[PDB]
RNA sequence: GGCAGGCUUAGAACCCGGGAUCCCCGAAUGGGGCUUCCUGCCGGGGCCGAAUAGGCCCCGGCGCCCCGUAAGGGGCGGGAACGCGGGGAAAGGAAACAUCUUAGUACCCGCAGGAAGGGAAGCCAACAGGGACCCCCUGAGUAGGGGCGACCGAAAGGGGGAUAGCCCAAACCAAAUCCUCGCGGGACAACCGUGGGGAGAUGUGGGGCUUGGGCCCGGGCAACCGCCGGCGGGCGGUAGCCGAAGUGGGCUGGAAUGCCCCGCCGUAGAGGGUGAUAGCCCCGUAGGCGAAACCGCCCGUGGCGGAGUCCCGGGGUCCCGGAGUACCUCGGCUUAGUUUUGCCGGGGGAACGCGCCGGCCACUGGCCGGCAAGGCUAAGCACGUCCCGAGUCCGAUAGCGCACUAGUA
RNA sequence: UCGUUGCGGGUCCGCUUACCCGCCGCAAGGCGGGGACAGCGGCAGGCGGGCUGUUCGGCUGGGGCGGCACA
C-alpha cells in the first residue's frame, strides 16, 4: 500500500489551539531527501511530491522508509510514476475574439486576482445556482425572512 | 438527350403532313442539341427545330425533316408508331 | 436483432417494425420427433414445399404442403387449410408458423442442409 | 421522477383579446383559429394546472437505527408462525419456525435439486401457492409493463455472496434469496407486513449475531 | 400572367404535376384508408404564393 | 501594425424609455481594451492566422498605435515551435511516454535496489 | 391488403462495412439574379456551313482576404443544447417612486470544443502551518453591501471527484539552426548523404524555468531530452449464431393459452406473439460463440536525432530574471469589497534582486509570505440533435402542436 | 481646464512640420490659406420639457372649491 503524506491543518486563530491532521499533497523534499531520493526518483517510483511544503514529518518519514523497503526487496509493486503520460494540445481559433490573449486575460481581470474573484466567474457561478435552485437560491430573500423570524420567536 | 416520342393525333397530323416529329427531351437541351442528337441517332437530316416548354415542365421538340426523309417512315422503323 | 428490452412496447415495436432477415426468424417451427431423430435438429424455419401438421384451430389435424410463405405478415398457406369465398374461388386460411409441426423436410436446398449442421452442431 | 413536458399547452401563439366581443376573456389564438380557446388548464390543448414536478421529493429517509431495529423486529416476526400464516404463507408441513436448514445446502447448485430440498423441507406448498396464484392484474399496468401480479413464497438466507444455492432458488415462483448481509425490509416484510416464511442455512445463523445490531 | 420567367413557371408546373387525388387502386391497395392527398387543391380557392 | 482612435467607446444615447439610472452617455466605456480591439480588427484582416500577443507602440492626440504579432498555424516552421505549438496543436501518443516512463521506472528500481537498500535497512 | 409484369437457387430481398452516381439553388466562389434562372472571357472539343469565315453547343479555369521564394496552403457556412469575449433593457418588487432590485438577466454582435473556460503562488495564513486548477458537500445567508429598506451576498478553512507538470525570453556561446525541393539510402515514416532554393546577426539553434539560473572546477551514467507509429498480439464497437422442458388425455368453446387429471425444464418463471388467460408452440431470457471490411483502445517490439543538455560535490558574490507595466489622480461600469473588488477611458508615471510586491484606511519599524506586468497543460464537472435502458408518468379533448400522406393542409 | 502642443527670439512677437481648410493629382506628391489657434478626446460649470422616468395625499351627505372635523 503506497503511503498518503500526513499533514498538519493549519491552526487558525479561530481554532482557539485546536490541531488536527489530513492527508497532504504530497511529501515534502526534506522528507525524501531524508530517505534519499530526489523529486524526480520519488514520481518515477510514483509517490506524491510536493516540492512547495517546507515541513517535515517523522511519520510521513517512517511510512516513506518502510513502503521503500518492501519496494526494494521486492514485495510491492509501485505504481506508474507521477508524470504526465499524456500530451494533448488543442489548436486554438479565435483566441482574440474569446479573450485569452493578453489584454483579454487582463480586462477579465485574471491578471490582479483569482478566477474564483473576478466578476465574471462570479455572474456564471450566481447563474448556474439560480437555475438549479440550489442551496441559497431556493428561496428568495431568504436571510431577511430568518432575521424577521428569529425576532418574533426570540422576543 | 431524347425522352421520348409525342404519338398524339396532332403529333401524327404534323408527322403525316409536315415531315415532322414530335420528341420529349431534356429541358436544358437547345436546338443545336437538338438537331444534333436526331442526325446521329437516327441518320437523318434535320431541316428545322421548333421548341417549347409545355405547362408540365417538359420541353417537346417538333423536328422537320429534309426532303428526302420521311417522318412516318421513322416512326415505323423505330416502332413508337 | 430484437430488442432485449422488458417493456412490452418496446417489443412489439421490434416485431412489428423488423426488417426480413430478422422476420425470417419467426417461421421457426418444431419437428417431429422422427425428423428430430434424422436430423439432430428441434426446429427448422418453414419453408414452401415442406410437409406440416397443422396443430390448433379449426384445421387441426390436417397434414399438407406448404404452398405459400409471406415473410411480411409471417404466415404460410397449407394445403387442405382452405374455403370457398362467395363466388365459389378456393382461398388459404393463413396459419402462424408456431401452430404447425414439421414433418417433412424440403432439403433440396444446399443453404438448409448448412443451417441444419449450424443447429445440429 | 415524473412529470410533463415543461413547455407543454404554453407555446401556442395565443392573447386574451379583452371584453367587447361578446365572448369570454380567456386567451385565444391569434391566428387563423382565432376565437379557439388557449392556454388555460380549462381550455383543450391548454396547460395542466399542477402537474407532478420531476423535483419532487418521493423517498422517505429513515434513520439507520430505525431502520436496523426494524430489521430485527421483521426478523424476529419470522420466527413466528401466527405471523407467517397470517401474512398469508402455507406453514402447515413446515417442522418448526424459524425454520433452519444446515450449512450443507449452499452447495447445491440445480433448480430439480432446490426443488427437493423445499419438497422435504415443507416449503413446497407455498412455492406451489405463489406459482398458481400468479395473475394478470386490472388496469393500466399492462401496458406500462406490470401485466402479472405474482405472490411471495420463500425467503432463502445464505451465508454470503455468490453460493450455488441462489442460482439454484432464484427461479423459482416468489422466491427471494439474499445473504444475510443483505437483509432488507423490501425482503423481510412485503407488503409493509411482517412474518415472512424464511429458510435459514446453519451458517448465515451464525454470521447474523454480529449484523443488524 | 402572358409573360412568365421560367422559374416561376417551372414551380406552377411542379403545382400542376403534384394537383391530383390519389388513384382507385390505391385506394383499394390501402382498403379505403388512403382516399386524400395534401396537394389537391382548387384553382379558385386555395392559391399558390409562386 | 493598427492605428485606430482613443478614447471611451461610442456608447449611444437610448432613444427609448429607461430610468435615469441607464441614461448617461459620458464616460461610460466598454470592459474591452484598445489593444484587445486592435488584435482582432488584425486578426479579420488576415482571415485563418492566430493572434499571439500585441503591444503599444505610441499615441498622438487623436490615435493609438499597436503592434500585434500573428502566426499562421499551417507553415511547417510554425508548427514544430515550442512556443508556437501551445497555440497550434500538439499530440504525443500515449505509447511512447508511457514506454519511456516505465522503463524509467524499472531501471530505478534496478538501481535504487543496489544503492539505498542497505542504508534505508541500516 | 389492388392490377400486371418481372427479379431471384448463376444465391435475390433484407442487415452491416466499403465504393459509384449524386440535377438546380445554397458559405456558393467567373459575373448577374424582379423569379432556384440568365450570362462573359480564355483553352480544348463537336456541329451547321462551300469554307479555315461566321455562328451555335459541350467540357475545364476564372470569389474576397491572407500565409508562402514558389509549388502550394488557410478562413468563410451549418449544428438541439452546453462554452468563451463584448454590447445590454424593461415589465414586475420595493404595497407610490428615483438610489436599488429585477440582472450582467432577456435579447443582440463576435468566437471555439467535444466539452469549453481555469490551472502550477509577486498565493493563503499567522509565528502553527498549508501547498496548481476545476467541479461537488459545507463554511453560509456568516462576514460584508444596501433609500442599512426591499433585498443582495463572499472568501479562507474542512470533506470528496481527480491528480501533472512544464515551456518562451534573458544571462552565457554566435549560424553549430530551421523550411522546401531534386537525386541515393532508409519500417511507404522519422531520419541519413548530397545538391539547389527560402528564412536567419533586427539572432535560427544550444542553454534555462524556485529544489532560480548563467558562469568556473571535480566526479558518475541508474544519463537526460526528443522524432516516427512500421511489425506482432489482445480487447471492444459497427451484421449475427447457439441456447432446457408437453403442444399430453377429457370439458367448454368458431378457435384455447382457460377448467379437471397427468408429466417435464429451470444459471432460463425478464418480456412479447400465436384464433380467450402459455415457464415447456414460437420469439426470446439465464448463459455462451462470433467479422471478409471499417473503426477505436491497450501491450510488446522496432527505427532514428540532440551542442551531456542528466545525477552528485564544491566555488561564486560578477551576470540575467518580462513597462506606458507597478503606482497616483479624475470620470464611469461592476463587485460583498466597505476611507479597502476588478476593469475601461483621460492625465501623470517607477525600481531592479543592495530590487520589487502582499499581509482588510495611510505611513514608519519589526516579522512573515512571495517574485507581477509572456505561453501551455490530461483527469476529475456542462449539454442533449442523437443511441440505449427504466418508469407508483399520459392513454387519442390526455400525452410533444403532430400515435395518422404534421410543422402537414 | 488637462492633452494633442513643436521651434526660435524678448507674459509677448515670429516660424512652420504638427494640425485644420480648399484646389490639382489614380496614387506618389505639388499649390494656396490658417496655424500651435482651431478642431478633437477627458474633466468642470452654465443654459437646457429638445428628449427619458416619475409624482401630483386623505377626509368628504357623490367628486370638485372650500375647511382640517389629519397631531
Ligand atoms: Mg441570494
Ligand atoms: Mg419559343
Ligand atoms: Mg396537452
Ligand atoms: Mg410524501
Ligand atoms: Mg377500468
Ligand atoms: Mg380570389
Ligand atoms: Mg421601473
Ligand atoms: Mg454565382
Ligand atoms: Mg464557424
Ligand atoms: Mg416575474
Ligand atoms: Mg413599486
Ligand atoms: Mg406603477
Ligand atoms: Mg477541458
Ligand atoms: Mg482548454
Ligand atoms: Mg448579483
Ligand atoms: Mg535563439
Ligand atoms: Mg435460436
Ligand atoms: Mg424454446
Ligand atoms: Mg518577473
Ligand atoms: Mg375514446
Ligand atoms: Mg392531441
Ligand atoms: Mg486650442
Ligand atoms: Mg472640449
Ligand atoms: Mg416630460
Ligand atoms: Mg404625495
Ligand atoms: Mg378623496
Ligand atoms: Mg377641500
Given at each position: 500500500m503506497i503511503p498518503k503524506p500526513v499533514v498538519q491543518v493549519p491552526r487558525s486563530i479561530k481554532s482557539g489551539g485546536v490541531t488536527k491532521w489530513?492527508?497532504?499533497?504530497?511529501?515534502?523534499?526534506?522528507?525524501?531527501?531524508?530517505?534519499?531520493?530526489?523529486?524526480?526518483?520519488?514520481?518515477?517510483?510514483?509517490?506524491?511530491?510536493?516540492?512547495?511544503?517546507?515541513?517535515?514529518?517523522?511519520?510521513?518519514?517512517?511510512?516513506?522508509?518502510?513502503?521503500?523497503?518492501?519496494?526494494?526487496?521486492?514485495?510491492?509493486?509501485?505504481?506508474?510514476?507521477?508524470?504526465?503520460?499524456?500530451?494533448?494540445?488543442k489548436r486554438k481559433r479565435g483566441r482574440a475574439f474569446r479573450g485569452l490573449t493578453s489584454a483579454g486575460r487582463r480586462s477579465r481581470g485574471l491578471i490582479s486576482t483569482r478566477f474564483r474573484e473576478t466578476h465574471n466567474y462570479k455572474f456564471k457561478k450566481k447563474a448556474k445556482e439560480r437555475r438549479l435552485k440550489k442551496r441559497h437560491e431556493a428561496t428568495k430573500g431568504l436571510g431577511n425572512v430568518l432575521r424577521i423570524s428569529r425576532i418574533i420567536n426570540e422576543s | 438527350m431524347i425522352k421520348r416520342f409525342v404519338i398524339t393525333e396532332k403529333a401524327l397530323r404534323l408527322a403525316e403532313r409536315e415531315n415532322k416529329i414530335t420528341i420529349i427531351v431534356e429541358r436544358t437541351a437547345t436546338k443545336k442539341q437538338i438537331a444534333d442528337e436526331v442526325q446521329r441517332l437516327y441518320n437523318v437530316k434535320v431541316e428545322k427545330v421548333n421548341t417549347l416548354i409545355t405547362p408540365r415542365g417538359e420541353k417537346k421538340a417538333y423536328v422537320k425533316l429534309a426532303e428526302g426523309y420521311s417522318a412516318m417512315d421513322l416512326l415505323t422503323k423505330l416502332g413508337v408508331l | 436483432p430484437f430488442t432485449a428490452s422488458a417493456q412490452p412496447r418496446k417489443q412489439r415495436l421490434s416485431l412489428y417494425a423488423a426488417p426480413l432477415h430478422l422476420r425470417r426468424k419467426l417461421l421457426n417451427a418444431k419437428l417431429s420427433p422422427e425428423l428430430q431423430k434424422k436430423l439432430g435438429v428441434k426446429r427448422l424455419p418453414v419453408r414452401r414445399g415442406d410437409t406440416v401438421l397443422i396443430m390448433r384451430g379449426d384445421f387441426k389435424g390436417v397434414t399438407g404442403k406448404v404452398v405459400k410463405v409471406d415473410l411480411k405478415r409471417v404466415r404460410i398457406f397449407v394445403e387442405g387449410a382452405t374455403r370457398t369465398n362467395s363466388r365459389g374461388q378456393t382461398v388459404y386460411y393463413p396459419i402462424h408458423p408456431s401452430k404447425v409441426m414439421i414433418v417433412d423436410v424440403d432439403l433440396s436446398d444446399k443453404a438448409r442442409q448448412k443451417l441444419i449442421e449450424r443447429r445440429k452442431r | 421522477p415524473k412529470g410533463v413536458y415543461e413547455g407543454a399547452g404554453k407555446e401556442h401563439s395565443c392573447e386574451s383579446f379583452g371584453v367587447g366581443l361578446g365572448i369570454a376573456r380567456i386567451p385565444r389564438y391569434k391566428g387563423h383559429l382565432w376565437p379557439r380557446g388557449c392556454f388555460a388548464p380549462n381550455t383543450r390543448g391548454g396547460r395542466r394546472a399542477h402537474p407532478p414536478r420531476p423535483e419532487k421529493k418521493l423517498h422517505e429517509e429513515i434513520n439507520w437505527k430505525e431502520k436496523n431495529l426494524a430489521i430485527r423486529s421483521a426478523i424476529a416476526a419470522t420466527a413466528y408462525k401466527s405471523w407467517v400464516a397470517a401474512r398469508g404463507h402455507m406453514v402447515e408441513k413446515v417442522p418448526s419456525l424459524p425454520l433452519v436448514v444446515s450449512g450443507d445446502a449452499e452447495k447445491i447448485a440445480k433448480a430439480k435439486e432446490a426443488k427437493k430440498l423445499f419438497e422435504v423441507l415443507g416449503l413446497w406448498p407455498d412455492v406451489e401457492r405463489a406459482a398458481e396464484g400468479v395473475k394478470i392484474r386490472a388496469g393500466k399496468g399492462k401496458m406500462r409493463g406490470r401485466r402479472y401480479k405474482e405472490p411471495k413464497s420463500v425467503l432463502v438466507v445464505v451465508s454470503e455472496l455468490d453460493v450455488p444455492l441462489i442460482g439454484a432458488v432464484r427461479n423459482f415462483p416468489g422466491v427471494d434469496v439474499v445473504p444475510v448481509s443483505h437483509l432488507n425490509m423490501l425482503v423481510l416484510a412485503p407488503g409493509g407486513v411482517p412474518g415472512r416464511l424464511t429458510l435459514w442455512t446453519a451458517t448465515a445463523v451464525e454470521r447474523l449475531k454480529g449484523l443488524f445490531l | 400572367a402572358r409573360n412568365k420567367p421560367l422559374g416561376k413557371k417551372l414551380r406552377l408546373a411542379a403545382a400542376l404535376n403534384s394537383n391530383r387525388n390519389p388513384p382507385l387502386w390505391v385506394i383499394a391497395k390501402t382498403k379505403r384508408r388512403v382516399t386524400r392527398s395534401p396537394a389537391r387543391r382548387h384553382w379558385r380557392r386555395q392559391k399558390l404564393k409562386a | 501594425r493598427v492605428r485606430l482612435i482613443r478614447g471611451p467607446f461610442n456608447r449611444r444615447r437610448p432613444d427609448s424609455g429607461r430610468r435615469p439610472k441607464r441614461m448617461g452617455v459620458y464616460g461610460i466605456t466598454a470592459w474591452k481594451s484598445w489593444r484587445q480591439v486592435a488584435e482582432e480588427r488584425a486578426a479579420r484582416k488576415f482571415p485563418g492566422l492566430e493572434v499571439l500577443?500585441?503591444?503599444?507602440?505610441?499615441?498622438?492626440?487623436?490615435?493609438?498605435?499597436?503592434?500585434?504579432?500573428?502566426?499562421?498555424?499551417?507553415?511547417?516552421?510554425?508548427?514544430?515551435?515550442?512556443?508556437?505549438?501551445?497555440?497550434?496543436?500538439?499530440?504525443?501518443?500515449?505509447?511512447?511516454?508511457?514506454?519511456?516512463?516505465?522503463?524509467?521506472?524499472?531501471?530505478?528500481?534496478?538501481?535504487?535496489?543496489?544503492?539505498?537498500?542497505?542504508?534505508?535497512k541500516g
Amino acid at each position: 500500500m503506497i503511503p498518503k503524506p500526513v499533514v498538519q491543518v493549519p491552526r487558525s486563530i479561530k481554532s482557539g489551539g485546536v490541531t488536527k491532521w489530513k492527508e497532504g499533497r504530497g511529501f515534502s523534499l526534506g522528507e525524501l531527501k531524508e530517505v534519499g531520493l530526489n523529486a524526480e526518483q520519488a514520481r518515477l517510483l510514483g509517490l506524491p511530491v510536493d516540492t512547495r511544503r517546507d515541513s517535515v514529518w517523522p511519520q510521513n518519514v517512517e511510512a516513506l522508509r518502510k513502503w521503500l523497503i518492501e519496494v526494494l526487496e521486492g514485495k510491492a509493486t509501485p505504481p506508474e510514476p507521477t508524470l504526465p503520460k499524456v500530451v494533448k494540445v488543442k489548436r486554438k481559433r479565435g483566441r482574440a475574439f474569446r479573450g485569452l490573449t493578453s489584454a483579454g486575460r487582463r480586462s477579465r481581470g485574471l491578471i490582479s486576482t483569482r478566477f474564483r474573484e473576478t466578476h465574471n466567474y462570479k455572474f456564471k457561478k450566481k447563474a448556474k445556482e439560480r437555475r438549479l435552485k440550489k442551496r441559497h437560491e431556493a428561496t428568495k430573500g431568504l436571510g431577511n425572512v430568518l432575521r424577521i423570524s428569529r425576532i418574533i420567536n426570540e422576543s | 438527350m431524347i425522352k421520348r416520342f409525342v404519338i398524339t393525333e396532332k403529333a401524327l397530323r404534323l408527322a403525316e403532313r409536315e415531315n415532322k416529329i414530335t420528341i420529349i427531351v431534356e429541358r436544358t437541351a437547345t436546338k443545336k442539341q437538338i438537331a444534333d442528337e436526331v442526325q446521329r441517332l437516327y441518320n437523318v437530316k434535320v431541316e428545322k427545330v421548333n421548341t417549347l416548354i409545355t405547362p408540365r415542365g417538359e420541353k417537346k421538340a417538333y423536328v422537320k425533316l429534309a426532303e428526302g426523309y420521311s417522318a412516318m417512315d421513322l416512326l415505323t422503323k423505330l416502332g413508337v408508331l | 436483432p430484437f430488442t432485449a428490452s422488458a417493456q412490452p412496447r418496446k417489443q412489439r415495436l421490434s416485431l412489428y417494425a423488423a426488417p426480413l432477415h430478422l422476420r425470417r426468424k419467426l417461421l421457426n417451427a418444431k419437428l417431429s420427433p422422427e425428423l428430430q431423430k434424422k436430423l439432430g435438429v428441434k426446429r427448422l424455419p418453414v419453408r414452401r414445399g415442406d410437409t406440416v401438421l397443422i396443430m390448433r384451430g379449426d384445421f387441426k389435424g390436417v397434414t399438407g404442403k406448404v404452398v405459400k410463405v409471406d415473410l411480411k405478415r409471417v404466415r404460410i398457406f397449407v394445403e387442405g387449410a382452405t374455403r370457398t369465398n362467395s363466388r365459389g374461388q378456393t382461398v388459404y386460411y393463413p396459419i402462424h408458423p408456431s401452430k404447425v409441426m414439421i414433418v417433412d423436410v424440403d432439403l433440396s436446398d444446399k443453404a438448409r442442409q448448412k443451417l441444419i449442421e449450424r443447429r445440429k452442431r | 421522477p415524473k412529470g410533463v413536458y415543461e413547455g407543454a399547452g404554453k407555446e401556442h401563439s395565443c392573447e386574451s383579446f379583452g371584453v367587447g366581443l361578446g365572448i369570454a376573456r380567456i386567451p385565444r389564438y391569434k391566428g387563423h383559429l382565432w376565437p379557439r380557446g388557449c392556454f388555460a388548464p380549462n381550455t383543450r390543448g391548454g396547460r395542466r394546472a399542477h402537474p407532478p414536478r420531476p423535483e419532487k421529493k418521493l423517498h422517505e429517509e429513515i434513520n439507520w437505527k430505525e431502520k436496523n431495529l426494524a430489521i430485527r423486529s421483521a426478523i424476529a416476526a419470522t420466527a413466528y408462525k401466527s405471523w407467517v400464516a397470517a401474512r398469508g404463507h402455507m406453514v402447515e408441513k413446515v417442522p418448526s419456525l424459524p425454520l433452519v436448514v444446515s450449512g450443507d445446502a449452499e452447495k447445491i447448485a440445480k433448480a430439480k435439486e432446490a426443488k427437493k430440498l423445499f419438497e422435504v423441507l415443507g416449503l413446497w406448498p407455498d412455492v406451489e401457492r405463489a406459482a398458481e396464484g400468479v395473475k394478470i392484474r386490472a388496469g393500466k399496468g399492462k401496458m406500462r409493463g406490470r401485466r402479472y401480479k405474482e405472490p411471495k413464497s420463500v425467503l432463502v438466507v445464505v451465508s454470503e455472496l455468490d453460493v450455488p444455492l441462489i442460482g439454484a432458488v432464484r427461479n423459482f415462483p416468489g422466491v427471494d434469496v439474499v445473504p444475510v448481509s443483505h437483509l432488507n425490509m423490501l425482503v423481510l416484510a412485503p407488503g409493509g407486513v411482517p412474518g415472512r416464511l424464511t429458510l435459514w442455512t446453519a451458517t448465515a445463523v451464525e454470521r447474523l449475531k454480529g449484523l443488524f445490531l | 400572367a402572358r409573360n412568365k420567367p421560367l422559374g416561376k413557371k417551372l414551380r406552377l408546373a411542379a403545382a400542376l404535376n403534384s394537383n391530383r387525388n390519389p388513384p382507385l387502386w390505391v385506394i383499394a391497395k390501402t382498403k379505403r384508408r388512403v382516399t386524400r392527398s395534401p396537394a389537391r387543391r382548387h384553382w379558385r380557392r386555395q392559391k399558390l404564393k409562386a | 501594425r493598427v492605428r485606430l482612435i482613443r478614447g471611451p467607446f461610442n456608447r449611444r444615447r437610448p432613444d427609448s424609455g429607461r430610468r435615469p439610472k441607464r441614461m448617461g452617455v459620458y464616460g461610460i466605456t466598454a470592459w474591452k481594451s484598445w489593444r484587445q480591439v486592435a488584435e482582432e480588427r488584425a486578426a479579420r484582416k488576415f482571415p485563418g492566422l492566430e493572434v499571439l500577443n500585441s503591444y503599444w507602440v505610441a499615441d498622438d492626440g487623436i490615435y493609438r498605435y499597436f503592434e500585434v504579432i500573428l502566426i499562421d498555424c499551417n507553415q511547417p516552421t510554425i508548427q514544430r515551435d515550442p512556443l508556437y505549438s501551445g497555440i497550434c496543436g500538439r499530440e504525443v501518443p500515449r505509447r511512447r511516454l508511457a514506454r519511456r516512463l516505465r522503463e524509467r521506472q524499472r531501471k530505478l528500481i534496478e538501481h535504487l535496489k543496489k544503492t539505498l537498500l542497505p542504508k534505508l535497512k541500516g
